[PDB]
Structure formats: C-alpha cells, structure tokens
Amino acid sequence: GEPQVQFKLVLVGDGGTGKTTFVKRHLTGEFEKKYVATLGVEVHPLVFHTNRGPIKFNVWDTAGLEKFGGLRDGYYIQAQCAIIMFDVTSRVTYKNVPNWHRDLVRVCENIPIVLCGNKVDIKDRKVKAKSIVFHRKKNLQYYDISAKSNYNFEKPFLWLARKLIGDPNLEFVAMPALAPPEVVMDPALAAQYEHDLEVAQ
Ligand SMILES: Nc1nc2c(ncn2[C@@H]2O[C@H](COP(=O)(O)OP(=O)(O)O)[C@@H](O)[C@H]2O)c(=O)[nH]1
Ligand SMILES: [Mg+2]
C-alpha cells in the first residue's frame, strides 16, 4: 500500500573529478546497484534516515567518461534534483561548470542543485574559496568535499532533503554505513578552508 518516498538524482561533471568514488562511499547502495545496460548508467539506491522517516535517493552515475553536451536527454528526463562536481586541483574542470549547468536546465528547468568541489585533501590546491564566490548565485549551494576521507559526505544530501520535503529543521537521526577513510584529511587544513568560505561570504 503506502509506498516509498524516492527521488531521481543526476550526478554530472567532467571525467576524472571523482563522481564514481563519491557515490561508492555508501556501501549498501554499491552492493544493491543496478546496471541499466542501454542508457550507459549505474543506478545506486542511497537510503538516508531522517527525523520524519526514511528517504531514498536513486543516484544515476554515468558509466562512461562523456563530455559536456554528450549526455542523452533520457539521462536527465524526470530528474528531481542534481549534483554538479569539479576537481579543486584542476582549473579546466571548474571552467566547464557553466556548460554542465546549461545542459541540466534546458531539459529540467528549476530543480534544486548542489555544487561540489572535490579532492580538498591535496595540499597543492588551485581553485580557492575567493574564486568560488562566483558561480554559486544561481540559487545553487556550494560545499567543499573529499570523497576518499568521507569529508562533508552528508551535507549535499541534507541540503537537498530539506528543499524537497519542505522543512528547514529536518535532520538525519543516524548515518549510513560508509567505506573507511583511505586518505588523510588534515584537521587544521579543513578548519582553514571553512574560515575562508565565511570570509568570502
Ligand atoms: N586523493 C583523492 N583522489 C580522489 C578523490 N576523488 C577522486 N579521486 C581520484 O580521481 C580518479 C578518478 O576518480 P573516478 O571516481 O573514477 O572519477 P569519475 O570519472 O568522475 O567517475 C581516481 O584515481 C580517484 O581515486 C578524493 O577525494 N581524493
Ligand atoms: Mg565514473
């Protein structure tokens, strides 16, 4: 009878930015993933547990290394939300963000979108906070991320659940089982970066 609250999420951005690494941190979603042969995609079911009940994000991760413009319409059709990703050690991935946005909005129009800057465990960072107080001003929320250490993993999913359910006080009551950190996210470096965003804001 009474079914599941489920949302289609489309994960997009340049080849090599860490999209498959980020979505694979949720272990039960990787083990139960579904290979949809004909659209070139892997659909991952990520269940999150809130104070108002359980929610599911059906994350569509492309299986190729496609280029801006080269994602069929079927990949985006009926999407309810999205995450756009770039790598902070490569400037060309961040310059392509606007074209990935243009592709989404043409097919889906006004849907809640989060912007993510990955690989902030690396010391030699090229794209900093002062240049990210830019683009995000499309009604787009920004978060610094590190996929291999699990740094800020829940933040993009918590922001999208608040918009789609309609409650700004919604919280997660327990965290999903996650793959153990494989790199070190220095604790004083993370604090320096957070201070930099507030300065930039
Ligand atoms: N150190 C580090 N490397 C990362 C991180 N995220 C991705 N990478 C590396 O980037 C390469 C490409 O990642 P992949 O997930 O295949 O990217 P995709 O093309 O967007 O699917 C891999 O060798 C990853 O291990 C991160 O958080 N930290
Ligand atoms: Mg991939």
Short mmCIF file of all heavy atoms in Angstrom, two decimals, residues 114-169:
data_model
loop_
_atom_site.label_atom_id
_atom_site.label_comp_id
_atom_site.label_asym_id
_atom_site.label_seq_id
_atom_site.Cartn_x
_atom_site.Cartn_y
_atom_site.Cartn_z
N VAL A 114 23.03 21.21 -6.12
CA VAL A 114 24.18 21.45 -5.25
C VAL A 114 25.49 21.44 -6.06
O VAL A 114 25.69 20.51 -6.85
CB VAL A 114 24.32 20.39 -4.13
CG1 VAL A 114 25.60 20.57 -3.30
CG2 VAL A 114 23.12 20.37 -3.19
N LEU A 115 26.42 22.37 -5.83
CA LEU A 115 27.72 22.39 -6.50
C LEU A 115 28.85 21.86 -5.61
O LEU A 115 29.02 22.42 -4.53
CB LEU A 115 28.04 23.82 -6.95
CG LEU A 115 29.42 24.05 -7.58
CD1 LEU A 115 29.52 23.32 -8.92
CD2 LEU A 115 29.70 25.55 -7.77
N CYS A 116 29.60 20.83 -6.00
CA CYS A 116 30.67 20.28 -5.17
C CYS A 116 32.11 20.37 -5.68
O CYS A 116 32.39 19.91 -6.78
CB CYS A 116 30.43 18.77 -4.86
SG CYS A 116 29.06 18.56 -3.66
N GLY A 117 33.05 20.84 -4.86
CA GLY A 117 34.48 20.92 -5.22
C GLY A 117 35.26 19.80 -4.48
O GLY A 117 35.36 19.84 -3.24
N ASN A 118 35.66 18.76 -5.20
CA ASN A 118 36.25 17.55 -4.66
C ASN A 118 37.76 17.60 -4.57
O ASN A 118 38.46 18.28 -5.34
CB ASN A 118 35.79 16.33 -5.50
CG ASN A 118 36.02 14.97 -4.83
OD1 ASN A 118 35.95 14.82 -3.59
ND2 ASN A 118 36.39 13.95 -5.59
N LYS A 119 38.37 16.72 -3.76
CA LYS A 119 39.77 16.44 -3.64
C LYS A 119 40.49 17.54 -2.87
O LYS A 119 41.70 17.77 -3.05
CB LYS A 119 40.50 16.19 -4.96
CG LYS A 119 40.08 15.08 -5.89
CD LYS A 119 40.92 14.85 -7.11
CE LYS A 119 40.18 13.88 -8.04
NZ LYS A 119 40.84 13.71 -9.35
N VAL A 120 39.89 18.09 -1.79
CA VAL A 120 40.47 19.05 -0.89
C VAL A 120 41.41 18.48 0.18
O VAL A 120 41.92 19.22 1.04
CB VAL A 120 39.42 19.94 -0.19
CG1 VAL A 120 38.50 20.67 -1.17
CG2 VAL A 120 38.58 19.14 0.82
N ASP A 121 41.82 17.22 0.18
CA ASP A 121 42.84 16.58 0.95
C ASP A 121 44.23 16.91 0.36
O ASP A 121 45.20 16.91 1.12
CB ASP A 121 42.70 15.04 1.08
CG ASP A 121 42.38 14.33 -0.22
OD1 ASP A 121 41.22 14.40 -0.71
OD2 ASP A 121 43.25 13.67 -0.81
N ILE A 122 44.32 17.17 -0.94
CA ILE A 122 45.54 17.58 -1.60
C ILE A 122 46.02 18.97 -1.19
O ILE A 122 45.34 19.98 -1.38
CB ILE A 122 45.36 17.49 -3.13
CG1 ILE A 122 45.24 16.00 -3.51
CG2 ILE A 122 46.50 18.10 -3.92
CD1 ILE A 122 43.88 15.58 -3.99
N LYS A 123 47.30 19.07 -0.79
CA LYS A 123 47.87 20.34 -0.39
C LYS A 123 48.00 21.34 -1.51
O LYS A 123 47.72 22.53 -1.24
CB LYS A 123 49.24 20.20 0.29
CG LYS A 123 49.32 19.26 1.48
CD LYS A 123 50.75 19.22 2.03
CE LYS A 123 50.86 18.20 3.15
NZ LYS A 123 51.79 18.62 4.23
N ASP A 124 48.41 21.01 -2.73
CA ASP A 124 48.57 21.95 -3.85
C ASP A 124 47.26 22.22 -4.59
O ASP A 124 47.03 21.74 -5.71
CB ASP A 124 49.66 21.43 -4.79
CG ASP A 124 50.09 22.34 -5.92
OD1 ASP A 124 50.04 23.58 -5.81
OD2 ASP A 124 50.44 21.85 -7.03
N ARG A 125 46.34 22.97 -4.00
CA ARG A 125 45.03 23.35 -4.46
C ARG A 125 45.08 24.56 -5.40
O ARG A 125 45.70 25.60 -5.13
CB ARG A 125 44.17 23.64 -3.20
CG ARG A 125 42.83 24.33 -3.41
CD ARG A 125 41.93 24.34 -2.18
NE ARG A 125 40.53 24.63 -2.47
CZ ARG A 125 39.46 24.64 -1.72
NH1 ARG A 125 39.47 24.37 -0.41
NH2 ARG A 125 38.27 24.93 -2.25
N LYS A 126 44.38 24.49 -6.51
CA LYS A 126 44.35 25.56 -7.50
C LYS A 126 43.12 26.47 -7.41
O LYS A 126 43.26 27.67 -7.67
CB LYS A 126 44.41 24.99 -8.91
CG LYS A 126 45.52 24.01 -9.19
CD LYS A 126 46.89 24.63 -9.21
CE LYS A 126 47.98 23.56 -9.21
NZ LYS A 126 49.31 24.20 -8.98
N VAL A 127 41.94 25.93 -7.21
CA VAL A 127 40.71 26.73 -7.17
C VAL A 127 40.28 26.94 -5.71
O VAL A 127 39.80 26.02 -5.04
CB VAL A 127 39.56 26.05 -7.94
CG1 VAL A 127 38.40 27.03 -8.19
CG2 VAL A 127 39.98 25.42 -9.26
N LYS A 128 40.47 28.16 -5.21
CA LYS A 128 40.16 28.52 -3.82
C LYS A 128 38.81 29.17 -3.63
O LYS A 128 38.18 29.58 -4.59
CB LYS A 128 41.27 29.47 -3.30
CG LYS A 128 42.62 28.78 -3.29
CD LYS A 128 43.77 29.56 -3.86
CE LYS A 128 45.06 29.23 -3.10
NZ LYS A 128 46.24 29.25 -4.01
N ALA A 129 38.39 29.37 -2.38
CA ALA A 129 37.17 29.98 -1.92
C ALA A 129 36.81 31.35 -2.47
O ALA A 129 35.72 31.60 -3.00
CB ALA A 129 37.25 30.14 -0.38
N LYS A 130 37.76 32.28 -2.59
CA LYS A 130 37.64 33.61 -3.14
C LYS A 130 37.23 33.63 -4.60
O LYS A 130 36.45 34.50 -5.00
CB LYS A 130 38.89 34.45 -2.91
CG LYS A 130 40.21 33.75 -3.17
CD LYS A 130 41.05 33.50 -1.95
CE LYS A 130 40.58 32.34 -1.09
NZ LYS A 130 41.66 31.85 -0.18
N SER A 131 37.63 32.69 -5.44
CA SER A 131 37.17 32.44 -6.77
C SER A 131 35.91 31.58 -6.81
O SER A 131 35.39 31.32 -7.90
CB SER A 131 38.21 31.69 -7.62
OG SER A 131 39.43 32.37 -7.73
N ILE A 132 35.41 30.98 -5.73
CA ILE A 132 34.16 30.23 -5.71
C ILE A 132 33.02 31.11 -5.22
O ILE A 132 31.83 30.82 -5.36
CB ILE A 132 34.28 28.89 -4.97
CG1 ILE A 132 35.47 28.06 -5.46
CG2 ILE A 132 33.03 28.01 -5.09
CD1 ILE A 132 35.85 26.87 -4.60
N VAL A 133 33.22 32.39 -4.88
CA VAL A 133 32.16 33.35 -4.60
C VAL A 133 31.84 34.25 -5.78
O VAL A 133 31.72 35.46 -5.75
CB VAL A 133 32.39 34.15 -3.31
CG1 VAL A 133 32.22 33.18 -2.14
CG2 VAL A 133 33.75 34.81 -3.29
N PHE A 134 31.60 33.71 -6.91
CA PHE A 134 31.36 33.49 -8.24
C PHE A 134 30.08 32.70 -8.53
O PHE A 134 29.12 32.81 -7.76
CB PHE A 134 32.53 32.55 -8.73
CG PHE A 134 33.14 33.09 -9.98
CD1 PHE A 134 34.49 33.40 -9.95
CD2 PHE A 134 32.41 33.32 -11.14
CE1 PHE A 134 35.15 33.87 -11.05
CE2 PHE A 134 33.04 33.85 -12.25
CZ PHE A 134 34.40 34.00 -12.19
N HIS A 135 30.05 31.83 -9.51
CA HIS A 135 29.01 30.96 -9.95
C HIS A 135 27.92 30.72 -8.95
O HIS A 135 26.81 31.26 -9.18
CB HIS A 135 29.56 29.60 -10.44
CG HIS A 135 28.66 28.97 -11.47
ND1 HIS A 135 28.90 29.06 -12.82
CD2 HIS A 135 27.52 28.25 -11.33
CE1 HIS A 135 27.95 28.42 -13.48
NE2 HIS A 135 27.10 27.91 -12.61
N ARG A 136 28.04 30.03 -7.83
CA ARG A 136 27.01 29.82 -6.83
C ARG A 136 26.35 31.13 -6.45
O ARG A 136 26.63 31.84 -5.47
CB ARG A 136 27.60 29.14 -5.59
CG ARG A 136 28.52 30.03 -4.77
CD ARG A 136 28.28 29.84 -3.28
NE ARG A 136 29.14 30.70 -2.47
CZ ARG A 136 29.13 30.72 -1.15
NH1 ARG A 136 28.30 29.94 -0.47
NH2 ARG A 136 29.95 31.53 -0.49
N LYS A 137 25.26 31.42 -7.04
CA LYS A 137 24.43 32.61 -7.17
C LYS A 137 23.57 32.54 -8.42
O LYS A 137 23.53 33.31 -9.32
CB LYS A 137 25.30 33.86 -7.17
CG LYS A 137 26.11 34.05 -5.90
CD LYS A 137 26.78 35.41 -5.86
CE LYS A 137 27.59 35.59 -4.59
NZ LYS A 137 28.25 36.92 -4.53
N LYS A 138 23.07 31.32 -8.52
CA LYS A 138 22.08 30.80 -9.45
C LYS A 138 20.97 30.07 -8.70
O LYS A 138 20.23 29.27 -9.19
CB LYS A 138 22.75 29.89 -10.47
CG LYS A 138 23.80 30.58 -11.32
CD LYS A 138 24.27 29.70 -12.46
CE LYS A 138 25.33 30.39 -13.30
NZ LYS A 138 25.79 29.54 -14.43
N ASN A 139 21.05 30.26 -7.35
CA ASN A 139 20.23 29.54 -6.38
C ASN A 139 20.75 28.12 -6.19
O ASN A 139 20.05 27.13 -6.15
CB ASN A 139 18.77 29.52 -6.82
CG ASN A 139 17.93 28.57 -6.00
OD1 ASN A 139 18.31 28.18 -4.90
ND2 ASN A 139 16.78 28.18 -6.54
N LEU A 140 22.07 28.06 -6.11
CA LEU A 140 22.95 26.93 -6.09
C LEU A 140 23.74 26.95 -4.78
O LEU A 140 24.30 27.99 -4.43
CB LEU A 140 23.94 27.08 -7.27
CG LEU A 140 24.16 25.87 -8.17
CD1 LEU A 140 22.85 25.53 -8.90
CD2 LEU A 140 25.27 26.06 -9.19
N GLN A 141 23.79 25.84 -4.07
CA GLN A 141 24.52 25.80 -2.79
C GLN A 141 25.89 25.18 -2.99
O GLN A 141 25.92 24.14 -3.68
CB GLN A 141 23.62 25.00 -1.84
CG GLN A 141 24.24 24.69 -0.50
CD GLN A 141 24.36 25.89 0.41
OE1 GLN A 141 23.82 26.96 0.13
NE2 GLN A 141 25.05 25.74 1.53
N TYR A 142 26.98 25.71 -2.48
CA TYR A 142 28.32 25.14 -2.63
C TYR A 142 28.80 24.35 -1.42
O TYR A 142 28.60 24.74 -0.26
CB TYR A 142 29.35 26.27 -2.96
CG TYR A 142 30.77 25.70 -3.08
CD1 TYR A 142 31.14 24.97 -4.20
CD2 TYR A 142 31.68 25.81 -2.03
CE1 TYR A 142 32.38 24.40 -4.31
CE2 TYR A 142 32.94 25.26 -2.13
CZ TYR A 142 33.27 24.53 -3.25
OH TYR A 142 34.51 23.93 -3.33
N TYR A 143 29.49 23.19 -1.54
CA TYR A 143 30.22 22.55 -0.47
C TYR A 143 31.62 22.05 -0.89
O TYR A 143 31.80 21.43 -1.95
CB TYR A 143 29.50 21.36 0.25
CG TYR A 143 28.26 21.72 1.04
CD1 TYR A 143 27.00 21.46 0.49
CD2 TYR A 143 28.30 22.46 2.22
CE1 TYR A 143 25.83 21.87 1.11
CE2 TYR A 143 27.14 22.84 2.86
CZ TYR A 143 25.91 22.54 2.29
OH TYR A 143 24.75 22.92 2.94
N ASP A 144 32.68 22.34 -0.13
CA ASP A 144 33.99 21.67 -0.28
C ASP A 144 33.85 20.19 0.19
O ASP A 144 33.16 19.92 1.20
CB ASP A 144 35.04 22.30 0.63
CG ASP A 144 35.87 23.46 0.17
OD1 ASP A 144 35.87 23.93 -0.99
OD2 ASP A 144 36.62 23.96 1.04
N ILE A 145 34.38 19.22 -0.54
CA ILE A 145 34.27 17.78 -0.34
C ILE A 145 35.64 17.08 -0.44
O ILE A 145 36.45 17.44 -1.28
CB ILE A 145 33.35 17.16 -1.42
CG1 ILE A 145 31.85 17.40 -1.27
CG2 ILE A 145 33.45 15.68 -1.73
CD1 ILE A 145 31.24 17.18 0.06
N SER A 146 35.86 15.95 0.25
CA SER A 146 36.87 14.96 -0.05
C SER A 146 36.23 13.55 0.01
O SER A 146 35.95 13.00 1.07
CB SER A 146 38.11 15.05 0.82
OG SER A 146 38.96 13.91 0.68
N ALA A 147 35.95 12.95 -1.14
CA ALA A 147 35.38 11.65 -1.35
C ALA A 147 36.14 10.51 -0.71
O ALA A 147 35.48 9.68 -0.05
CB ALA A 147 35.26 11.34 -2.86
N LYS A 148 37.50 10.46 -0.80
CA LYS A 148 38.28 9.41 -0.20
C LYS A 148 38.44 9.44 1.32
O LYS A 148 38.91 8.42 1.86
CB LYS A 148 39.66 9.28 -0.85
CG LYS A 148 39.75 8.68 -2.23
CD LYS A 148 39.59 7.18 -2.23
CE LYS A 148 40.19 6.50 -3.45
NZ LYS A 148 41.65 6.82 -3.64
N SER A 149 38.12 10.46 2.07
CA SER A 149 38.18 10.52 3.52
C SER A 149 36.79 10.66 4.10
O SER A 149 36.54 10.74 5.30
CB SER A 149 39.02 11.72 4.00
OG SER A 149 38.46 12.94 3.49
N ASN A 150 35.73 10.78 3.27
CA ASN A 150 34.35 11.00 3.72
C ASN A 150 34.12 12.41 4.27
O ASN A 150 33.05 12.69 4.80
CB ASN A 150 33.87 9.94 4.75
CG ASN A 150 33.83 8.48 4.32
OD1 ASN A 150 33.67 8.10 3.15
ND2 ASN A 150 34.13 7.57 5.24
N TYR A 151 34.90 13.44 3.94
CA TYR A 151 34.79 14.80 4.48
C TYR A 151 33.62 15.55 3.87
O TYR A 151 33.30 15.46 2.67
CB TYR A 151 36.13 15.55 4.40
CG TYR A 151 36.08 17.00 4.86
CD1 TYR A 151 36.00 17.36 6.20
CD2 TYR A 151 36.12 18.01 3.91
CE1 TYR A 151 35.87 18.70 6.57
CE2 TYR A 151 36.02 19.34 4.26
CZ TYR A 151 35.90 19.69 5.61
OH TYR A 151 35.85 21.03 5.93
N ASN A 152 32.67 15.97 4.69
CA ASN A 152 31.40 16.59 4.34
C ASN A 152 30.52 15.72 3.44
O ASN A 152 29.67 16.31 2.72
CB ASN A 152 31.59 17.96 3.69
CG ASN A 152 32.07 19.10 4.54
OD1 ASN A 152 32.05 19.08 5.77
ND2 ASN A 152 32.55 20.18 3.90
N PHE A 153 30.48 14.39 3.52
CA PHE A 153 29.74 13.48 2.70
C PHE A 153 28.23 13.68 2.80
O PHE A 153 27.57 13.62 1.76
CB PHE A 153 30.10 11.99 2.99
CG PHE A 153 29.31 11.04 2.12
CD1 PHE A 153 29.70 10.83 0.82
CD2 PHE A 153 28.14 10.42 2.58
CE1 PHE A 153 28.98 10.03 -0.04
CE2 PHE A 153 27.41 9.61 1.74
CZ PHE A 153 27.83 9.41 0.44
N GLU A 154 27.67 13.90 3.97
CA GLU A 154 26.26 14.09 4.19
C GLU A 154 25.67 15.46 3.87
O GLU A 154 24.43 15.55 3.76
CB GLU A 154 25.90 13.74 5.66
CG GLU A 154 26.03 14.83 6.67
CD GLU A 154 27.41 15.29 7.06
OE1 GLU A 154 28.43 14.61 6.77
OE2 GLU A 154 27.48 16.38 7.70
N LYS A 155 26.47 16.51 3.71
CA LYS A 155 26.00 17.87 3.51
C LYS A 155 25.20 18.15 2.27
O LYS A 155 24.09 18.68 2.39
CB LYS A 155 27.15 18.87 3.63
CG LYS A 155 27.77 18.77 5.04
CD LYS A 155 27.50 20.05 5.81
CE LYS A 155 28.87 20.62 6.26
NZ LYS A 155 29.19 20.04 7.60
N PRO A 156 25.61 17.65 1.08
CA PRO A 156 24.82 17.80 -0.13
C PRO A 156 23.48 17.08 -0.03
O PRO A 156 22.44 17.66 -0.42
CB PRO A 156 25.65 17.21 -1.27
CG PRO A 156 27.02 16.93 -0.73
CD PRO A 156 26.93 17.06 0.76
N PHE A 157 23.43 15.86 0.52
CA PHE A 157 22.20 15.13 0.73
C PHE A 157 21.27 15.74 1.77
O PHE A 157 20.06 15.76 1.54
CB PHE A 157 22.48 13.63 0.99
CG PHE A 157 23.34 13.00 -0.08
CD1 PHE A 157 24.72 12.95 0.03
CD2 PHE A 157 22.75 12.44 -1.21
CE1 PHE A 157 25.51 12.39 -0.97
CE2 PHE A 157 23.52 11.87 -2.20
CZ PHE A 157 24.90 11.84 -2.10
N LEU A 158 21.76 16.34 2.86
CA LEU A 158 20.97 17.03 3.86
C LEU A 158 20.32 18.30 3.32
O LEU A 158 19.09 18.48 3.47
CB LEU A 158 21.75 17.30 5.15
CG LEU A 158 21.05 17.97 6.32
CD1 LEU A 158 19.80 17.22 6.78
CD2 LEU A 158 21.96 18.13 7.54
N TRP A 159 21.07 19.11 2.56
CA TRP A 159 20.52 20.30 1.90
C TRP A 159 19.44 19.93 0.89
O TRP A 159 18.34 20.52 1.00
CB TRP A 159 21.59 21.17 1.26
CG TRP A 159 21.13 22.52 0.80
CD1 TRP A 159 21.10 23.66 1.58
CD2 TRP A 159 20.62 22.92 -0.48
NE1 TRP A 159 20.63 24.72 0.83
CE2 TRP A 159 20.32 24.28 -0.42
CE3 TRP A 159 20.44 22.24 -1.69
CZ2 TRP A 159 19.84 25.02 -1.51
CZ3 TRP A 159 19.96 22.95 -2.77
CH2 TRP A 159 19.64 24.33 -2.67
N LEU A 160 19.62 18.96 -0.03
CA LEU A 160 18.57 18.55 -0.95
C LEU A 160 17.33 17.97 -0.25
O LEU A 160 16.21 18.35 -0.64
CB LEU A 160 19.04 17.56 -2.03
CG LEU A 160 20.14 17.98 -3.00
CD1 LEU A 160 20.77 16.78 -3.69
CD2 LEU A 160 19.62 18.93 -4.09
N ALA A 161 17.42 17.13 0.79
CA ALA A 161 16.25 16.68 1.54
C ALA A 161 15.44 17.81 2.18
O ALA A 161 14.20 17.75 2.15
CB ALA A 161 16.60 15.66 2.64
N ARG A 162 16.04 18.84 2.78
CA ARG A 162 15.32 20.00 3.32
C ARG A 162 14.50 20.70 2.23
O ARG A 162 13.27 20.80 2.44
CB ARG A 162 16.24 20.97 4.04
CG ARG A 162 16.78 20.47 5.37
CD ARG A 162 17.88 21.36 5.95
NE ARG A 162 18.25 20.88 7.27
CZ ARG A 162 19.19 21.26 8.11
NH1 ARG A 162 20.02 22.25 7.80
NH2 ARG A 162 19.34 20.67 9.30
N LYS A 163 15.01 21.01 1.05
CA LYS A 163 14.25 21.59 -0.04
C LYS A 163 13.08 20.77 -0.55
O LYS A 163 12.00 21.35 -0.71
CB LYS A 163 15.15 21.93 -1.24
CG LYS A 163 16.18 23.01 -0.99
CD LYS A 163 15.55 24.39 -0.82
CE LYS A 163 15.07 24.90 -2.19
NZ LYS A 163 15.14 26.38 -2.28
N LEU A 164 13.23 19.50 -0.86
CA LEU A 164 12.24 18.60 -1.39
C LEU A 164 11.15 18.17 -0.40
O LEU A 164 10.02 17.95 -0.86
CB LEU A 164 12.88 17.32 -1.98
CG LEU A 164 13.90 17.54 -3.10
CD1 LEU A 164 14.97 16.47 -3.10
CD2 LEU A 164 13.24 17.64 -4.48
N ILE A 165 11.44 18.05 0.89
CA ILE A 165 10.41 17.74 1.90
C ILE A 165 9.72 18.99 2.39
O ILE A 165 8.51 18.97 2.66
CB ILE A 165 10.97 16.84 3.00
CG1 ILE A 165 11.16 15.42 2.39
CG2 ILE A 165 10.11 16.72 4.24
CD1 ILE A 165 12.18 14.59 3.12
N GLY A 166 10.37 20.16 2.40
CA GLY A 166 9.79 21.42 2.78
C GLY A 166 10.00 21.77 4.24
O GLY A 166 9.26 22.56 4.84
N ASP A 167 11.06 21.24 4.84
CA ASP A 167 11.31 21.50 6.26
C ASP A 167 12.77 21.83 6.49
O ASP A 167 13.61 20.94 6.55
CB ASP A 167 10.87 20.28 7.06
CG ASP A 167 11.09 20.29 8.54
OD1 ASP A 167 11.69 21.19 9.16
OD2 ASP A 167 10.66 19.31 9.19
N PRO A 168 13.03 23.08 6.94
CA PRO A 168 14.35 23.58 7.24
C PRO A 168 15.01 23.09 8.50
O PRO A 168 16.24 23.19 8.66
CB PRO A 168 14.24 25.11 7.26
CG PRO A 168 12.85 25.47 6.93
CD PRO A 168 12.04 24.19 6.95
N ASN A 169 14.28 22.55 9.47
CA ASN A 169 14.78 21.88 10.64
C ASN A 169 14.92 20.36 10.46
O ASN A 169 15.19 19.65 11.44
CB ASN A 169 13.83 22.16 11.82
CG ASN A 169 13.43 23.60 12.02
OD1 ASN A 169 14.24 24.49 12.32
ND2 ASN A 169 12.13 23.90 11.86
#
